[PDB]
């Protein structure tokens, strides 16, 4: 009983990798290069002196 | 059985599998396996190896 094996093994494992947040991903649109955001502040309600 | 290792996903059969060979001609459950060559004595990527030096 006798002879050989064949050449290369090719095993390229490689693993996918995922990405953890993108349901955090939102879909921009790439026009214009500033974006701002705001609120308004409280205040409060006061005395009601007349005089 | 099914003892051998399962490439797909969901679709094994999950039920009697066979081999169907010999256990008569047409009949069992189907689960054949193919050698590439029947009585295995040199594996051709030597040959392939043994020729290409060659030329």
Redesign the interface.
């Given at each position: 009983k006798y002879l050989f094996p064949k050449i290369n093994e090719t095993l390229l494992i490689d693993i996918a990798l995922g990405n953890r947040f993108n349901w955090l991903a939102k879909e921009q649109d790439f026009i214009g290069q500033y974006s701002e955001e705001y609120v308004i502040m409280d205040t409060v309600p006061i005395n009601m002196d007349l005089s | 059985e099914d003892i051998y290792f399962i490439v797909p996903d969901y679709l094994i059969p999950d039920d009697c599998l066979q081999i169907h060979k010999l256990y008569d001609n047409c009949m069992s459950g189907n689960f054949v396996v193919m050698q590439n060559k029947p009585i295995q004595?040199?594996?051709?990527?030597?040959i392939?190896?043994h020729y290409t030096d060659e030329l």
């Open positions: - | 004595y040199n594996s051709d990527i030597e392939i190896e």
